[PDB]
Design a protein around this ligand. Structure first.
Ligand SMILES: C=CC1=C(C)[C@@H](Cc2[nH]c(/C=C3N=C(/C=C4/NC(=O)[C@H](C)[C@H]4CC)C(C)=C\3CCC(=O)O)c(CCC(=O)O)c2C)NC1=O
Ligand SMILES: C=CC1=C(C)[C@@H](Cc2[nH]c(/C=C3N=C(/C=C4\NC(=O)[C@H](C)[C@H]4CC)C(C)=C\3CCC(=O)O)c(CCC(=O)O)c2C)NC1=O
Ligand SMILES: C=CC1=C(C)[C@@H](Cc2[nH]c(/C=C3N=C(/C=C4\NC(=O)[C@H](C)[C@H]4CC)C(C)=C\3CCC(=O)O)c(CCC(=O)O)c2C)NC1=O
Ligand SMILES: C=CC1=C(C)[C@@H](Cc2[nH]c(/C=C3N=C(/C=C4\NC(=O)[C@H](C)[C@H]4CC)C(C)=C\3CCC(=O)O)c(CCC(=O)O)c2C)NC1=O
Ligand SMILES: CCC1=C(C)[C@@H](CC2=N/C(=C\c3[nH]c(C[C@@H]4NC(=O)C(C)=C4CC)c(C)c3CCC(=O)O)C(CCC(=O)O)=C2C)NC1=O
Lengths: 234, 176, 164, 186
């Protein structure tokens, strides 16, 4: 049906080594690793048929592909530079005839300074009584600020019931102070509900992804790791 | 058997890859000096009769125990067989020099020779002595340094082919 | 591997003779022709993907019936295997040009082709139409020189005649 | 090796136009791609010198003329995305992509009710407005975020406007732009 690869996200610092692994479940035999840069331009980085490299687009020797099985294709990157920050895409298709089936893709972020990451602050407002009494509709708003990077997925769970209708997350952020080093990026989300649901007596969960156990976090600042903070709102 | 060209192909088959530019350039050097290779080989063949009698008589003189009663070159039947098979070894060396690969020497003459020489009681110490004389004679003929026999040939170097002949005769001595 | 060198060595070996002038005359012929053949092998090596991929398309254009269910090439896995065989044949033709004879063709693709294709129900005219189209594009001197085209077309006519 | 003109084309529903992707060398086949808001590419077309229809679109390819065309008709809201044309031109080995085209569709409002209410901030919804007005430096305005009630089939474009300075209120959020005269005061 589709191609799935792990890990979903990975952020590291300068000098670290990264490796994304892709696996595909179809009867395909040729995989590609597309390196789409910050300009959303897709340029082929590696292609592997079975066990033999078939495409080398003047790739520097630092990038080294390691393939074990025809369903596996890894990439080990040494001497990683900040300028190599890009989104990496895994593809699979038959070598001669057939269309290419793509996967979700992985985003890689390299930090100039590792001390520029801070925990987010989340605040949820209450529906206005005048708005609900005038327009017969209530809309909830959740806001997250002071977070990094953009590795968030917002879901709303209404009393333990999974819902896939009425969710809207901003595609792109807005820069506040251009040329002022690395400006803060934030995105807002909105929740439109029915009058009956709000009238008859719900949690904005902001997923966070950062460093892993393979990186040394020995700094004085508290580690902004995932924890359980629960808020309620009607 | 396999020649110089066919050895390149067999190697490229094991990886299921076309003959690359790097391997093709190696063949082009083989072809460019192909006149030298025939020029070498003709020198060996033209003196094949005297090379063998150099070896067999030379091996006997340093080891007189071969022609003593009970030796393995005592009668005329054994002496004739020593000359016959010693010439066969030289014949297959010229095939290897002509073809440019030692596969023909290993497959058709050197395969199973050691186990046969044990059955007949042929000494291995004396056999390798006779072969090592043949290598010294062929190399001296190849480089055109024979004391009493000169052949007119355009000036040049043949260290590449003399090293080729020396290694082929070393394969025979190492097998048995 | 039949070639110029092995044919004469095998002929001399059977008679128990040293390589004479007749045998050294045959190898001299290889030196003259090796210039032309090794240009054709270089051209094919750097463009095998384009030749093979267009050759397979001409086969399926001439015989659309291979697409029907119950025939060879009735699914996408089968159709890929059809192109893979043409690559194998175009690979051995590259071997034939380098070796200089019909050696690699005879002992690796032609020897048991009659029994294998009959057992697997692969029509022989599908492979013939693949090589006829390739032999028709071949033009001089844009693709290769005058002598290289003769050497390349010679190997292709050998393959077709075995499938005829 | 692909030239695309114009870069972007925003068409109203019912207006007729076409999308073109041009190539310099012979191409066996072209793959058309759709990029969603998450950024994932979903395969749209896959044809080799032929015509394929899917919904309200149609594509074509002429090998002798080295071009491909794409036609759109009666654009729907769900068809928002980024258009990408990829060709297997060159040595018939690698896929080359174009620049891309972005298209967005706005909904029809049956009854506009422009009004702004003030919501108390513990420790401002500009909805029901006209889509003919565009927004741009120092103003913190986010992009229009689309909502759709699939039960009642009610669509609306709504936006949020906030700031850090306490001297600014939600009443004059659309101050730098040209606000319509339809503004209602309490
Ligand atoms: C060096 C020797 C060598 C070859 C020459 C080929 C020979 C060959 N090809 C196929 C593989 C195949 N070849 C085809 C393709 C085709 N479908 C069509 O439309 C056509 C009629 C036909 C080619 C024109 C099909 C259908 C198969 C699958 C099994 C079969 O042969 O029926 C198979 C079966 C399994 C396999 O893939 O190995 C074999 C033995 N392969 C080799 O390794
Ligand atoms: C496959 C390769 C190949 C060979 C090399 C020969 C191998 C070979 N040589 C001999 C034959 C022989 N081999 C030798 C030769 C020697 N004994 C000595 O004392 C020397 C050290 C040594 C020099 C080489 C002798 C003397 C005989 C006869 C006696 C015997 O068979 O042991 C025989 C037995 C037949 C006969 O007696 O004529 C055979 C099979 N034939 C081949 O086609
Ligand atoms: C039909 C069979 C056949 C042969 C027998 C040779 C004959 C031959 N020999 C050389 C000539 C040559 N071959 C040699 C080799 C040698 N130089 C030395 O120092 C050694 C004494 C000698 C090897 C024994 C060299 C160095 C040349 C000079 C040019 C060259 O490299 O070919 C040449 C090229 C120039 C010329 O005509 O003289 C030819 C055709 N080749 C053939 O086509
Ligand atoms: C291994 C050997 C071997 C080859 C490498 C091919 C050579 C070959 N010829 C064409 C095919 C072509 N060659 C020409 C030109 C011509 N117009 C014609 O009708 C004539 C054939 C020719 C007269 C000069 C053009 C224009 C194409 C089509 C592809 C292109 O646009 O270049 C192609 C397709 C793509 C390309 O041009 O590279 C190939 C691979 N033939 C072989 O057998
Ligand atoms: C009495 C029993 C008897 C012999 C026979 C010799 C055997 C002999 N002569 C040699 C050496 C030898 N012999 C020849 C052949 C010969 N020389 C020529 O130069 C020309 C033109 C020849 C034609 C007949 C060559 C070509 C060599 C190599 C070196 C050389 O050029 O002399 C070698 C090789 C060296 C080695 O392997 O150790 C030995 C031992 N000695 C013996 O005990």
């Amino acid at each position: 049906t589709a191609v799935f690869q792990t890990p979903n996200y990975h952020v590291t610092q300068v000098g670290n080594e990264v490796s994304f692994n892709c696996k595909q479940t179809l009867g395909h035999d040729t995989m590609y690793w597309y390196k789409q840069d910050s300009k959303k331009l897709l340029k082929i980085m590696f292609s592997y048929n079975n066990k033999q490299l078939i495409v080398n687009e003047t790739v520097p020797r630092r990038f080294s592909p390691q393939s074990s099985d025809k369903a596996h294709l890894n990439l080990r990157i040494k001497s990683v530079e900040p300028e190599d920050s890009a989104v990496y895409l895994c593809a699979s298709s038959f070598r001669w005839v057939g269309e290419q089936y793509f996967g979700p893709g992985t985003r890689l972020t390299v930090l100039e300074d590792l001390k520029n990451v801070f925990p987010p602050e989340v605040a949820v407002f209450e529906p206005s009584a005048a708005a609900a009494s005038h327009t017969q509709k209530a809309t909830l708003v959740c806001l997250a600020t002071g977070f990094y990077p953009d590795h968030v997925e917002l879901s709303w769970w209404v009393n333990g019931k999974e819902v896939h209708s009425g969710v809207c997350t901003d595609p792109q952020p807005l820069k506040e102070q251009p040329a002022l080093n690395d400006s803060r990026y934030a995105l807002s989300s909105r929740l439109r509900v029915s009058a009956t649901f709000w009238q008859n007596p719900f949690r904005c969960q902001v997923q966070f992804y950062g460093l892993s156990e393979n990186d040394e976090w020995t700094q004085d600042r508290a580690k902004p790791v995932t924890q359980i903070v629960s808020a309620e709102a009607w | 058997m396999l020649d110089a060209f066919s050895r390149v192909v067999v190697n490229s088959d094991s990886k299921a890859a076309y003959v690359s530019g790097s391997d093709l350039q190696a063949l082009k050097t083989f072809i460019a000096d192909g006149n030298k290779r025939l020029d070498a080989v003709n020198s060996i063949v033209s003196n094949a009769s005297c090379i063998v009698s150099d070896a067999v008589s030379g091996m006997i003189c340093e080891n007189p125990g071969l022609i003593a009663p009970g030796g393995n070159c005592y009668t005329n039947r054994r002496m004739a067989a020593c000359l016959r098979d010693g010439e066969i070894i030289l014949r297959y060396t010229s095939y290897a020099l002509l073809a440019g690969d030692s596969s023909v020497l290993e497959d058709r003459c050197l395969n199973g020779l050691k186990e046969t020489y044990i059955a007949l009681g042929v000494p291995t110490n004396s056999t390798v002595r006779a072969v090592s004389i043949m290598k010294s004679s062929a190399v001296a003929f190849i480089s055109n340094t024979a004391s009493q026999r000169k052949m007119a040939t355009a000036d040049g170097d043949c260290s590449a082919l003399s090293s080729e002949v020396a290694s082929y005769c070393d394969k025979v001595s190492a097998a048995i | 591997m039949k070639s110029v060198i092995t044919t004469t060595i095998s002929a001399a070996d059977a008679a128990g003779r040293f390589p004479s002038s007749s045998d050294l005359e045959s190898v001299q012929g290889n030196i003259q022709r090796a210039a032309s053949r090794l240009e054709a092998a270089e051209k094919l090596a750097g463009n095998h993907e384009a030749v093979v991929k267009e050759a397979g398309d001409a086969c399926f254009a001439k015989y659309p019936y291979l697409k029907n269910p119950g025939e060879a090439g009735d699914s996408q896995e089968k159709i890929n295997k059809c192109y893979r065989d043409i690559d194998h044949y175009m690979r051995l033709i590259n071997y034939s040009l380098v070796v200089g004879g019909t050696g690699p063709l005879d002992e690796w693709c032609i020897a048991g082709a009659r029994e294998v294709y009959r057992a697997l129900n692969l029509p022989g005219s599908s492979y013939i139409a693949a090589f006829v189209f390739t032999r028709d594009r071949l033009c001089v001197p844009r693709d290769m020189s005058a002598q290289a085209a003769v050497e390349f077309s010679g190997a292709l006519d050998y393959v077709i005649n075995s499938l005829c | 090796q692909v030239e695309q003109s114009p870069s972007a084309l925003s068409l109203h529903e019912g207006t007729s136009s076409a999308l073109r992707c041009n190539f310099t060398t012979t191409t066996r086949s072209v793959q058309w791609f759709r990029q969603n808001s998450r950024g994932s590419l979903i395969n749209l077309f896959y044809l080799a010198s032929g015509t394929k229809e899917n919904g309200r679109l149609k594509s074509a390819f002429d090998s002798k003329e080295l071009y491909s065309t794409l036609h759109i008709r009666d654009a729907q809201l769900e068809d928002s995305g980024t258009y990408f044309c990829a060709a297997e031109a060159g040595s018939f080995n690698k896929l080359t992509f174009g620049a891309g085209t972005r298209l967005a569709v706005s909904p029809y409002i049956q009854n506009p009710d422009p009004a702004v209410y003030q919501l108390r901030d513990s420790k401002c919804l500009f909805t029901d407005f006209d889509s003919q007005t565009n927004v741009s430096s120092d103003v913190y305005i986010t992009d229009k975020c689309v909502l759709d009630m699939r039960s009642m089939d009610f669509k609306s474009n709504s936006a949020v406007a906030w700031s850090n300075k306490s001297d600014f209120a939600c009443a004059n959020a659309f101050n730098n732009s040209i606000i319509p005269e339809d503004t209602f005061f309490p």
